[PDB]
Amino acid sequence: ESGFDYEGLIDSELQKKRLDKSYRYFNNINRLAKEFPLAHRQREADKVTVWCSNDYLALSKHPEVLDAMHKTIDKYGCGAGGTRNIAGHNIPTLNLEAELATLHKKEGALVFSSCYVANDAVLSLLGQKMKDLVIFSDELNHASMIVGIKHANVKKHIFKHNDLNELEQLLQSYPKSVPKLIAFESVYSMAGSVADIEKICDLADKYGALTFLDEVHAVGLYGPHGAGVAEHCDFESHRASGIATPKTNDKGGAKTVMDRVDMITGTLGKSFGSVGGYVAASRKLIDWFRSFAPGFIFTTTLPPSVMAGATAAIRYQRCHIDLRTSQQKHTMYVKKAFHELGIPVIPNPSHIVPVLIGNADLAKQASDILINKHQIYVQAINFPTVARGTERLRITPTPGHTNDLSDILINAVDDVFNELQLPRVRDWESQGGLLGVVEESNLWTSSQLSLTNDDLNPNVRDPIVKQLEVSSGIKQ
Amino acid sequence: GFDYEGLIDSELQKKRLDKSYRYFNNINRLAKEFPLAHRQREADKVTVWCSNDYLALSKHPEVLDAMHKTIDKYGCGAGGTRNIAGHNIPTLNLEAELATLHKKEGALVFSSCYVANDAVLSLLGQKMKDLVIFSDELNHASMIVGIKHANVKKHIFKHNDLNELEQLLQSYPKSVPKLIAFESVYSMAGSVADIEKICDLADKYGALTFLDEVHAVGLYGPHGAGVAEHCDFESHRASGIATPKTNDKGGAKTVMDRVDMITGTLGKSFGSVGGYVAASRKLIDWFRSFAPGFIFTTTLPPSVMAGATAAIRYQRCHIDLRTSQQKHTMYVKKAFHELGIPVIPNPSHIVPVLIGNADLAKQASDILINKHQIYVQAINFPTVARGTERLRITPTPGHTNDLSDILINAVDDVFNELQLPRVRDWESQGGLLGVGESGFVEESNLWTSSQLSLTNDDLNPNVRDPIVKQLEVSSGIKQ
């Protein structure tokens, strides 16, 4: 007999990706902490300006983040040396979880290796323990949420993106007593659209569902303190109360939107300048995940210095709203320039500047020309990250992308569009349009963008954050 | 389930009642005072004996120097995914070093070995729906989860029972795709798989092999490449960094070469965090291109990768790390043997101390840390079967005989204080897990007397300061 042809199967599957042009070539990009947002390629002499990083507030290089790392390394070394149950539970872990709980004004928070792992662990456990659970999932949810929902192994319904009429009809089709989960994101990063979190909470109350909210692309960027779009929903109540829970919401009600969301997940690998993921929720939910989630239990704890760096970034960004107003103003500068030039930015009320291409091969060629000819780094985005035919260049301005740098980007993208004769806004219109190329108004209003750090409650500057019992287990 | 809080309360209460509810210990390991750590207060110091920082490299000067220098240049976070802004020189060097260590065409780094195991196993079953997985009953939770996620037929074979494995493989045509998934070193009792015979079975019955060396990398083989390397110890030592022309028996391929997929962690011997798979470049490109747990997550911080790279390079050419760990482990095992302290026999670096009761194991651990300033965690269900609860002791090159003497006397005292069973007491009841079993022959140590006499001067010079070229497959293969 002869064995199965494993290599033949692998070859055929990779060949298909080459054929449809989704096969990926990674770019060697070495970001320079001393020259943000510059990076160098294979050689240090070849520098480029990074315009697609998710280090949204430039805090990966902030002096307070690096100092926290250096000091923690001197004391703790590199690896944690164990798991949370065995030798891997320590003060940096306790401080990080407490800061995250404080940021979202939740009873607790639990740190995982990544938000991918956190989403998978949370969603997996919910379905494994509630086999009658019905999950209602936004069609554009991130791969980590799709995977977690699959692992949950429960009935699921996918509702069209941000379509709350369909969502309600799906929720209506069950008795209220059936356990339900609504899983969605605050900011969907590839096109930058935003969920109506308050209406989803209203639907969850009415039809008896828990809410699972992924704020990976909003933490650090929305709300007065960077706690996410959920915080932005009661912007003035949270700004007035600062670190404290407000007595009423922006509409005069009892509970803020962020308070009403049952589970909020975030990453430490973007705005917070590090690596890792977390869920913030009631202490009972946190203890539940801590006690039952194998992706939490059976893996090495993140290095102490990595946690300390994220902690420093969280604390700094909490009391620096100028990071957020600065990012938004730079994004608006780029968006306005591209609109005047007919550069097809997918309209969104967020910090993302995705430029529609619509062809995987043309997107790669545009990215290659940008980096090789113009020393501008924007990676081409293709399937599976985005649907085939919606390939795009995702530009992410930060507080470090000042107008002088933006002008260089703008001229470079304009030039690449001319060199490759790529479709402009008017050309997408001629074909019927795609992905919006009614625009939602910016999440950050003119009034909010005029706020300074002097407009924050003094209690968010250097707060003393007590460690949480639930991080170690609750004694009865 | 409309009452969610009641369900959560009920399930948490069950864990409290069965006493599987965990209380974590605040332990802050001191890079300058290894293996000491401090508790909540810096003045409250203990000696850590249960860390998986197996070679003490989490504090090695070359590891910390690599972190500090990389931080100043790169900052903290990678700032993206491998596809978007998160692909860099530290990543390329780490993957190339890992491929070189296992003498494989490529290696792919993940957030953790949990993630790597889940990703590889998940993809194998997703893309081969006819796959049949054969899994050792003692496989780690990450492998159990990955195999479940693979969503294919599976057979669990009795631990290290290769007669049963063969009977299971024989029950299928050779043409059916198969995966044999196992570990080299099982951490809870320290037993070792017969990797060569499993490879022989895989060839005969047409199976891929998936081997988790998490508890072997850094510790076995002349260069720390794992038990697979130890299987051809002299061929690898002679060739150093290069692939040997023949194996220790004069055959064509070494055991490590024959294993299709090898996974490891960066979070134990290599003193950092992360995981990887080492395999052919086609398999690596396959995982790189299709595994969502690889694609859709932030790349590990450059300094974390650089630290792991420094540890890998240092440990490769310092076999005295391995001879030192083994001699310290043997020192502890011998002393416990003379005192009747019941160590589960095993030919590895682990010193599991048999207790036999979950509450008594926890109590022994509590007394050790609070009364004796010795930190050893109690291992209970589900990690081990009820009635097999144990204290897991893991000596390292940093646990000198002076520290071992304190440990030995402390455990002896705790056994007396709690009236815990000695070897002879287990002997009276029929023995358990090789402790006090009549006619039980202990597997001989993987590290032989001859191997333990080797020094760093006995390694090929080409493993000191090798120039390791970056791999094309880490970035994608242009055709």
Ligand SMILES: Cc1ncc(COP(=O)(O)O)c(C=O)c1O
């Ligand atoms: C055998 C085995 N495989 C995989 C893992 C997971 O390793 P990591 O901590 O890198 O996720 C562990 C760690 O406990 C393990 O013991």
Ligand SMILES: Cc1ncc(COP(=O)(O)O)c(C=O)c1O
């Ligand atoms: C919406 C969303 N959720 C979760 C994740 C996973 O985040 P992490 O990098 O921490 O694994 C991502 C990262 O790309 C994401 O975009």
Ligand SMILES: [K+]
């Ligand atoms: K040979």
